[PDB]
PDB file of C-alpha atoms in Angstrom:
ATOM      1  CA  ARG S   1     -25.099  16.325   4.884  1.00  0.00           C
ATOM      2  CA  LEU S   2     -21.611  14.253   5.156  1.00  0.00           C
ATOM      3  CA  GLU S   3     -20.026  17.267   3.495  1.00  0.00           C
ATOM      4  CA  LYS S   4     -21.685  17.820  -0.070  1.00  0.00           C
ATOM      5  CA  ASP S   5     -18.247  17.822  -1.970  1.00  0.00           C
ATOM      6  CA  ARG S   6     -16.662  15.275  -4.642  1.00  0.00           C
ATOM      7  CA  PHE S   7     -13.188  14.619  -3.451  1.00  0.00           C
ATOM      8  CA  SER S   8     -10.669  12.778  -5.103  1.00  0.00           C
ATOM      9  CA  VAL S   9      -7.448  10.803  -3.610  1.00  0.00           C
ATOM     10  CA  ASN S  10      -5.049   9.335  -5.827  1.00  0.00           C
ATOM     11  CA  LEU S  11      -3.515   5.991  -5.380  1.00  0.00           C
ATOM     12  CA  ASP S  12      -0.740   5.142  -7.724  1.00  0.00           C
ATOM     13  CA  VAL S  13       0.666   2.079  -8.491  1.00  0.00           C
ATOM     14  CA  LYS S  14       3.318   2.829 -11.193  1.00  0.00           C
ATOM     15  CA  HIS S  15       2.564  -0.655 -13.391  1.00  0.00           C
ATOM     16  CA  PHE S  16       0.808  -3.320 -12.268  1.00  0.00           C
ATOM     17  CA  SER S  17      -2.462  -5.447 -13.218  1.00  0.00           C
ATOM     18  CA  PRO S  18      -5.690  -5.291 -11.420  1.00  0.00           C
ATOM     19  CA  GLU S  19      -5.788  -8.954 -10.509  1.00  0.00           C
ATOM     20  CA  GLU S  20      -2.719  -8.181  -8.494  1.00  0.00           C
ATOM     21  CA  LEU S  21      -4.087  -5.470  -6.627  1.00  0.00           C
ATOM     22  CA  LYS S  22      -6.238  -5.038  -3.456  1.00  0.00           C
ATOM     23  CA  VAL S  23      -7.712  -1.917  -2.529  1.00  0.00           C
ATOM     24  CA  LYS S  24      -8.627  -1.392   1.069  1.00  0.00           C
ATOM     25  CA  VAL S  25     -10.375   1.067   2.753  1.00  0.00           C
ATOM     26  CA  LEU S  26     -10.576   0.880   6.263  1.00  0.00           C
ATOM     27  CA  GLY S  27     -11.877   3.533   8.337  1.00  0.00           C
ATOM     28  CA  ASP S  28      -9.539   6.246   8.413  1.00  0.00           C
ATOM     29  CA  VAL S  29      -6.834   4.294   6.229  1.00  0.00           C
ATOM     30  CA  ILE S  30      -7.013   4.061   2.632  1.00  0.00           C
ATOM     31  CA  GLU S  31      -4.788   1.218   1.034  1.00  0.00           C
ATOM     32  CA  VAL S  32      -3.489  -0.052  -2.147  1.00  0.00           C
ATOM     33  CA  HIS S  33      -1.888  -3.449  -2.198  1.00  0.00           C
ATOM     34  CA  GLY S  34      -0.580  -4.869  -5.123  1.00  0.00           C
ATOM     35  CA  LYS S  35       1.739  -8.073  -5.500  1.00  0.00           C
ATOM     36  CA  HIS S  36       3.483  -9.517  -8.772  1.00  0.00           C
ATOM     37  CA  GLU S  37       5.259 -12.159  -9.197  1.00  0.00           C
ATOM     38  CA  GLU S  38       8.465 -10.600 -11.323  1.00  0.00           C
ATOM     39  CA  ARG S  39      10.925 -13.581 -12.237  1.00  0.00           C
ATOM     40  CA  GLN S  40      10.221 -17.003 -11.683  1.00  0.00           C
ATOM     41  CA  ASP S  41      13.251 -19.302 -11.730  1.00  0.00           C
ATOM     42  CA  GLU S  42      14.560 -22.701 -10.296  1.00  0.00           C
ATOM     43  CA  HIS S  43      12.985 -22.778  -7.019  1.00  0.00           C
ATOM     44  CA  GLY S  44      13.183 -19.470  -6.735  1.00  0.00           C
ATOM     45  CA  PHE S  45      10.776 -17.031  -7.298  1.00  0.00           C
ATOM     46  CA  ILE S  46      11.253 -13.190  -7.032  1.00  0.00           C
ATOM     47  CA  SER S  47       8.182 -10.949  -6.286  1.00  0.00           C
ATOM     48  CA  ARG S  48       7.569  -7.262  -5.853  1.00  0.00           C
ATOM     49  CA  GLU S  49       5.005  -5.499  -4.271  1.00  0.00           C
ATOM     50  CA  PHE S  50       3.682  -2.065  -4.458  1.00  0.00           C
ATOM     51  CA  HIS S  51       1.666  -0.737  -1.063  1.00  0.00           C
ATOM     52  CA  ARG S  52       0.548   2.863  -0.864  1.00  0.00           C
ATOM     53  CA  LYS S  53      -0.569   3.756   2.645  1.00  0.00           C
ATOM     54  CA  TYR S  54      -2.939   6.794   3.820  1.00  0.00           C
ATOM     55  CA  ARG S  55      -4.141   7.447   7.014  1.00  0.00           C
ATOM     56  CA  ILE S  56      -6.823  10.237   6.287  1.00  0.00           C
ATOM     57  CA  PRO S  57     -10.071  10.349   8.601  1.00  0.00           C
ATOM     58  CA  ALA S  58     -10.942  13.963   7.589  1.00  0.00           C
ATOM     59  CA  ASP S  59     -10.969  13.312   4.126  1.00  0.00           C
ATOM     60  CA  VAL S  60     -12.045   9.512   3.826  1.00  0.00           C
ATOM     61  CA  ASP S  61     -15.049   8.190   5.328  1.00  0.00           C
ATOM     62  CA  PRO S  62     -15.325   4.256   3.917  1.00  0.00           C
ATOM     63  CA  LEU S  63     -19.132   4.797   3.439  1.00  0.00           C
ATOM     64  CA  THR S  64     -19.133   7.478   1.249  1.00  0.00           C
ATOM     65  CA  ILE S  65     -15.258   6.960  -0.311  1.00  0.00           C
ATOM     66  CA  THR S  66     -15.379   4.555  -3.100  1.00  0.00           C
ATOM     67  CA  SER S  67     -12.387   3.295  -5.026  1.00  0.00           C
ATOM     68  CA  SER S  68     -11.925   3.529  -9.159  1.00  0.00           C
ATOM     69  CA  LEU S  69      -9.305   1.283 -10.731  1.00  0.00           C
ATOM     70  CA  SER S  70      -7.338   1.940 -14.119  1.00  0.00           C
ATOM     71  CA  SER S  71      -5.581  -0.954 -15.740  1.00  0.00           C
ATOM     72  CA  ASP S  72      -2.223   0.159 -15.253  1.00  0.00           C
ATOM     73  CA  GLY S  73      -2.601   0.237 -11.110  1.00  0.00           C
ATOM     74  CA  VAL S  74      -3.750   3.559 -11.075  1.00  0.00           C
ATOM     75  CA  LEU S  75      -6.576   3.297  -8.420  1.00  0.00           C
ATOM     76  CA  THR S  76      -8.889   6.660  -7.451  1.00  0.00           C
ATOM     77  CA  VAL S  77     -10.892   7.133  -4.280  1.00  0.00           C
ATOM     78  CA  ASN S  78     -13.496   9.113  -4.533  1.00  0.00           C
ATOM     79  CA  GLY S  79     -16.790  10.063  -3.264  1.00  0.00           C
ATOM     80  CA  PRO S  80     -17.940  12.933  -0.799  1.00  0.00           C
ATOM     81  CA  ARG S  81     -15.539  14.360   1.968  1.00  0.00           C
ATOM     82  CA  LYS S  82     -15.975  13.894   5.460  1.00  0.00           C
TER      83      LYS S  82
ATOM     84  CA  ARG E   1      32.037 -33.371   4.654  1.00  0.00           C
ATOM     85  CA  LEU E   2      28.757 -31.629   4.198  1.00  0.00           C
ATOM     86  CA  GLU E   3      30.121 -31.410   0.369  1.00  0.00           C
ATOM     87  CA  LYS E   4      32.570 -29.981  -0.532  1.00  0.00           C
ATOM     88  CA  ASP E   5      32.070 -27.781  -3.723  1.00  0.00           C
ATOM     89  CA  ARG E   6      31.598 -23.841  -3.549  1.00  0.00           C
ATOM     90  CA  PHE E   7      27.867 -23.314  -4.193  1.00  0.00           C
ATOM     91  CA  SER E   8      26.370 -20.180  -5.059  1.00  0.00           C
ATOM     92  CA  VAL E   9      22.686 -19.154  -5.718  1.00  0.00           C
ATOM     93  CA  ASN E  10      22.379 -15.303  -6.508  1.00  0.00           C
ATOM     94  CA  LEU E  11      19.312 -13.619  -5.024  1.00  0.00           C
ATOM     95  CA  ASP E  12      18.693 -10.143  -7.056  1.00  0.00           C
ATOM     96  CA  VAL E  13      16.932  -7.171  -6.010  1.00  0.00           C
ATOM     97  CA  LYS E  14      17.106  -4.850  -8.895  1.00  0.00           C
ATOM     98  CA  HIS E  15      17.451  -1.734  -6.988  1.00  0.00           C
ATOM     99  CA  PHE E  16      17.579  -0.831  -3.461  1.00  0.00           C
ATOM    100  CA  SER E  17      20.046   0.017  -0.869  1.00  0.00           C
ATOM    101  CA  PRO E  18      21.324  -2.873   1.411  1.00  0.00           C
ATOM    102  CA  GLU E  19      19.605  -0.898   4.557  1.00  0.00           C
ATOM    103  CA  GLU E  20      16.599  -1.519   2.977  1.00  0.00           C
ATOM    104  CA  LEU E  21      17.484  -4.931   2.544  1.00  0.00           C
ATOM    105  CA  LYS E  22      16.970  -8.122   4.843  1.00  0.00           C
ATOM    106  CA  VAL E  23      18.317 -11.371   4.072  1.00  0.00           C
ATOM    107  CA  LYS E  24      17.309 -14.188   5.532  1.00  0.00           C
ATOM    108  CA  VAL E  25      17.968 -17.789   5.431  1.00  0.00           C
ATOM    109  CA  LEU E  26      16.037 -20.270   7.506  1.00  0.00           C
ATOM    110  CA  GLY E  27      16.726 -23.951   6.937  1.00  0.00           C
ATOM    111  CA  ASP E  28      15.537 -24.630   3.626  1.00  0.00           C
ATOM    112  CA  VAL E  29      14.458 -21.454   2.727  1.00  0.00           C
ATOM    113  CA  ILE E  30      16.619 -18.768   1.651  1.00  0.00           C
ATOM    114  CA  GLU E  31      14.605 -15.112   0.761  1.00  0.00           C
ATOM    115  CA  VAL E  32      15.685 -11.838   0.397  1.00  0.00           C
ATOM    116  CA  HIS E  33      13.173  -8.701   1.613  1.00  0.00           C
ATOM    117  CA  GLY E  34      13.829  -5.360   0.418  1.00  0.00           C
ATOM    118  CA  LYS E  35      11.254  -2.250   1.320  1.00  0.00           C
ATOM    119  CA  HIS E  36      11.796   0.854   0.014  1.00  0.00           C
ATOM    120  CA  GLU E  37       9.683   4.193   0.573  1.00  0.00           C
ATOM    121  CA  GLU E  38       9.362   5.221  -2.923  1.00  0.00           C
ATOM    122  CA  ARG E  39       7.262   8.668  -2.666  1.00  0.00           C
ATOM    123  CA  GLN E  40       6.066  10.386   0.315  1.00  0.00           C
ATOM    124  CA  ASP E  41       3.107  12.604   0.180  1.00  0.00           C
ATOM    125  CA  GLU E  42       0.434  14.539   2.018  1.00  0.00           C
ATOM    126  CA  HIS E  43      -0.441  11.844   4.413  1.00  0.00           C
ATOM    127  CA  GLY E  44       0.103   9.108   2.089  1.00  0.00           C
ATOM    128  CA  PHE E  45       3.184   7.189   1.708  1.00  0.00           C
ATOM    129  CA  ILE E  46       3.970   4.834  -1.071  1.00  0.00           C
ATOM    130  CA  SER E  47       6.427   1.876  -0.727  1.00  0.00           C
ATOM    131  CA  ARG E  48       7.790  -0.850  -2.837  1.00  0.00           C
ATOM    132  CA  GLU E  49       9.031  -4.184  -1.483  1.00  0.00           C
ATOM    133  CA  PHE E  50      11.078  -6.918  -3.082  1.00  0.00           C
ATOM    134  CA  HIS E  51      10.694 -10.254  -2.105  1.00  0.00           C
ATOM    135  CA  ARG E  52      12.677 -13.219  -3.623  1.00  0.00           C
ATOM    136  CA  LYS E  53      11.739 -16.620  -2.197  1.00  0.00           C
ATOM    137  CA  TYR E  54      13.715 -19.676  -2.720  1.00  0.00           C
ATOM    138  CA  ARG E  55      13.201 -23.087  -1.150  1.00  0.00           C
ATOM    139  CA  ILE E  56      16.120 -24.888  -1.534  1.00  0.00           C
ATOM    140  CA  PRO E  57      17.123 -27.659   1.252  1.00  0.00           C
ATOM    141  CA  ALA E  58      19.261 -29.710  -0.802  1.00  0.00           C
ATOM    142  CA  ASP E  59      21.091 -26.767  -1.540  1.00  0.00           C
ATOM    143  CA  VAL E  60      20.931 -24.502   1.046  1.00  0.00           C
ATOM    144  CA  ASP E  61      21.947 -25.586   4.520  1.00  0.00           C
ATOM    145  CA  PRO E  62      22.125 -22.254   7.235  1.00  0.00           C
ATOM    146  CA  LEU E  63      25.633 -23.318   8.503  1.00  0.00           C
ATOM    147  CA  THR E  64      27.426 -23.534   5.793  1.00  0.00           C
ATOM    148  CA  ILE E  65      25.860 -21.196   3.356  1.00  0.00           C
ATOM    149  CA  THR E  66      26.399 -17.369   3.645  1.00  0.00           C
ATOM    150  CA  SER E  67      25.144 -14.151   2.649  1.00  0.00           C
ATOM    151  CA  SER E  68      27.313 -11.500   0.636  1.00  0.00           C
ATOM    152  CA  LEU E  69      25.373  -8.129  -0.762  1.00  0.00           C
ATOM    153  CA  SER E  70      26.193  -5.966  -3.250  1.00  0.00           C
ATOM    154  CA  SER E  71      24.965  -2.184  -3.014  1.00  0.00           C
ATOM    155  CA  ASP E  72      22.552  -2.410  -5.613  1.00  0.00           C
ATOM    156  CA  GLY E  73      20.479  -5.224  -3.817  1.00  0.00           C
ATOM    157  CA  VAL E  74      22.418  -8.143  -5.457  1.00  0.00           C
ATOM    158  CA  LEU E  75      22.711 -10.352  -2.714  1.00  0.00           C
ATOM    159  CA  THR E  76      24.881 -13.747  -3.401  1.00  0.00           C
ATOM    160  CA  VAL E  77      24.349 -16.906  -1.031  1.00  0.00           C
ATOM    161  CA  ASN E  78      27.648 -18.797  -1.039  1.00  0.00           C
ATOM    162  CA  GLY E  79      29.264 -21.970   0.814  1.00  0.00           C
ATOM    163  CA  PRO E  80      29.327 -25.499   0.505  1.00  0.00           C
ATOM    164  CA  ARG E  81      26.469 -27.125  -0.355  1.00  0.00           C
ATOM    165  CA  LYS E  82      24.382 -29.850   0.946  1.00  0.00           C
TER     166      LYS E  82
END
């Protein structure tokens, strides 16, 4: 069955835009990485990153858990649970 | 002489605490890295990072340029210029 239940974990990035996001699910880890250039100056650029890291194997199987994303940086991982 | 002038470049991290900061000057690059755990949950932790990156060789020589830091994350690189 691979557990019939719709499971959802949410990943939150407070404010970023989807093009500056990378969502990665790798086995037992579900992580979201966002990186944005904040302020560009002289020859100095300033960047900020958001990384949320989860390690959940019992709750996450990469074959059934999928990711949906909102424009603000909210990422939701959903699918049948393990 | 190695140019007698007090030169200052500022590196800004909007809000962080000095223990979550690393300031690095490596030749022609002057960079500040800050990393903070934002929100800790279930088995998911959320982090944010601030990285400011400069590449200035004509303005930065690691032997004379030094770094001073404020508690809010403001880092100032100062010293005689190249």
